[PDB]
């Protein structure tokens, strides 16, 4: 209703575009509710370019005690950039939120495209999934060369740009290892995209990201994770049991090469898990699946994507159907919170 009107106004702005503070960006509809607060489209008045602005609400920060997570995402993304990691352009704060302003990816997220491709036939066909898996691998590799364990990766954090190329994004649940450790404990990541090691609270290396890659590849093709059914996701406790105990099932929609590849990544034990064993990430690349992919051209962005997003119809989420989390029930900020808020802004 109004939500279509808001979407239409965004489209109207996009059309014009194709052809700090809140007094520096004209604000449009939300595009999702991220890990911390809203992520809405916005536009610079000084150059007429569209950006997504991940706002981290002060209220929501206090409730979840999400102060660590905020600082991590900032420092990592600010320093680390590639062709498969989104650029960070600005870090300021506003009245009621801390802002990270990053480059547009107005092509929608992979999770959206799983069901949008066809409502009654969700999931991609084989070439399209294979292509995206190869691009995700390059992004993961870039993190691993900098000695960063992401501890997460899921379709909704894999964004498509206008062309149709995919990129990983959000490094807020990551940890950068120092030289002196190779494994570390934690519980970082979103359930079902967390590896066995993470769930058991054990130490783990780079391996967990390759487990997540497996979950992603499976989900693109079958329209469900390895550890849950179609259009259903079980509770965190049950999901934790699924990841630890259940052996992956497959239809024959998968090619033998893709099946075998997916199994290798979804292997439970880091030693037998394909990926970075501190040798090469190009050992993974030797799998027969990638005989249909040219890696040199992929890395140079010269391969034509299988799906090309429309530049008029936006595939970002509708406003009122994005996520949400409670704002405070009267809870007034600590001195510590205020000090973090000033510090965050740059």
């Amino acid at each position: 209703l109004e939500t279509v009107v808001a979407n239409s106004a965004f489209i109207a702005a996009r059309g014009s575009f194709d052809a700090m503070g809140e007094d520096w960006f004209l604000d449009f509809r939300v595009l999702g509710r991220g890990g911390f607060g809203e992520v809405f489209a916005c536009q610079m008045k000084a150059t007429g370019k569209l950006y997504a602005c991940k706002k981290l609400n002060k209220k929501r920060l206090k409730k979840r005690k999400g102060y660590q997570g905020a600082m991590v995402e900032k420092k990592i993304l600010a320093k680390v950039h590639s062709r498969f990691i989104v650029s960070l352009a600005y870090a300021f704060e506003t009245k009621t939120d801390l802002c990270l302003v990053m480059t547009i990816m107005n092509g929608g997220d992979i999770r959206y495209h799983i069901y949008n491709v066809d409502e009654d036939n969700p999931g991609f066909q084989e070439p399209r999934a294979i292509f995206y898996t190869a691009q995700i691998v390059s992004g993961l590799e870039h993190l691993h060369q900098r000695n960063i364990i992401y501890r997460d990766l899921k379709p909704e954090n894999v964004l498509l740009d206008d062309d149709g190329n995919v990129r990983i994004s959000d490094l807020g649940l990551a940890v950068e290892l120092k030289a002196g450790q190779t494994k570390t404990k934690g519980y970082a990541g979103t359930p079902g995209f967390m590896a066995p090691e993470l769930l058991l609270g054990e130490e783990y290396d780079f391996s967990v990201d390759y487990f997540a890659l497996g979950v992603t590849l499976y989900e693109m093709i079958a329209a469900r994770g390895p550890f849950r059914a179609r259009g259903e996701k079980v509770e965190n406790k049950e999901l934790k049991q699924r990841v630890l105990e259940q052996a992956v099932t497959y239809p024959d929609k998968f090619s033998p090469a893709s099946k075998d590849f997916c199994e290798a990544l979804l292997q439970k034990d880091p030693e037998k898990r394909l990926g970075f064993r501190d040798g090469s990430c190009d050992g993974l690349r030797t799998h027969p699946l990638f005989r249909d992919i040219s890696w040199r051209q992929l890395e140079a962005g010269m391969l034509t994507p299988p799906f090309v997003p429309d530049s008029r119809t936006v595939y970002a989420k509708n406003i009122q159907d994005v996520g949400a989390f409670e704002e405070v029930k009267g809870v007034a900020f600590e001195k510590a919170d205020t000090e973090f808020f000033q510090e965050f802004a740059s």
Epitope: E126, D252, S255, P256
Partner: antibody, heavy 123, light 109 residues
Framework: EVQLVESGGGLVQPGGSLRLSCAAS????????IHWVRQAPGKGLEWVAY????????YYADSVKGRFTISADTSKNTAYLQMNSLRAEDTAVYYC????????????????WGQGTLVTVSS | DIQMTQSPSSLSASVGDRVTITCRAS??????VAWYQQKPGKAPKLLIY???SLYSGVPSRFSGSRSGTDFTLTISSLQPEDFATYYC??????????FGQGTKVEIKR
């Protein structure tokens, strides 16, 4: 290629053992499947069972079940079918199929067939 | 498996006729059908793979068309050397392989 010459010929008694063995060469067996195709004399083409290198999936036809035990070698590309139960319908001018592996998820027909050497089951 | 049903059972046509034979698979196998020419005491020659794509080193009078469950092989102009039994086949890269019952092409007089 065309060079898929049986070197497992000769008469073998019913219920006997003779290892039919493909003299496969002119390609490398790991992008192909050397599943045994039998042109029974004056009768139509049939399938026996799947053969794979790395993939290691093997599946019988629903009429040769456990009468043959498939085996494979990638050091000479020979594919050996063990004989261990035979009837008289296991008389054919055996050929070695060669079947492409996909270039996305592509299934083709059988590019080449052997030159055969007759195998008979008779008493 | 997936049954392959050939039609017609036999046909009799003269040289220089356009002959189309049909093959129906019981279950859809996508584009994954082949066609063979078998002449007695010879190795089978592959004519068509992928339901409609010509095999290299096969004459261009053979063509195939169609997908779904109903597959076709067409001989544009019949020859006196097209006396043969023609077999359709379904292929699968994770399933069985099954052949037809043959279509007998007879040279008419």
């Amino acid at each position: 290629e065309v060079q898929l010459v049986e070197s497992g010929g000769g008469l073998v008694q019913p219920g006997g053992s003779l290892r039919l063995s493909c003299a496969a060469s002119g390609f490398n067996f790991s992008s192909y499947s050397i599943h045994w195709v039998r042109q029974a004399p004056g009768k139509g083409l049939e399938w026996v069972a799947y053969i794979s290198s790395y993939y290691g999936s093997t599946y019988y036809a629903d009429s040769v079940k456990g009468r043959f035990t498939i085996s494979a070698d990638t050091s000479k590309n020979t594919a050996y079918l063990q004989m261990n139960s035979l009837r008289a319908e296991d008389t054919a001018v055996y050929y070695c199929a060669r079947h492409e592996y996909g270039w996305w998820n592509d299934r083709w027909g059988l590019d080449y067939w052997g030159q055969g050497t007759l195998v008979t089951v008779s008493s | 498996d997936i049954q392959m049903t050939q039609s017609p059972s036999s046909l009799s046509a003269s040289v220089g006729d356009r002959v189309t034979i049909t093959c129906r698979a019981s279950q859809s196998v996508s584009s994954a059908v082949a066609w063979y020419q078998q002449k007695p005491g010879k190795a089978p020659k592959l004519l068509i793979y992928s339901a409609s794509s010509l095999y290299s080193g096969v004459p261009s009078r053979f063509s195939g068309s169609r997908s779904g469950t109903d597959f076709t092989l067409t001989i544009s102009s019949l020859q006196p050397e097209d006396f043969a039994t023609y077999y359709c086949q379904q292929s699968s890269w994770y399933g069985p392989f099954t052949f037809g019952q043959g279509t007998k092409v007879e040279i008419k007089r």
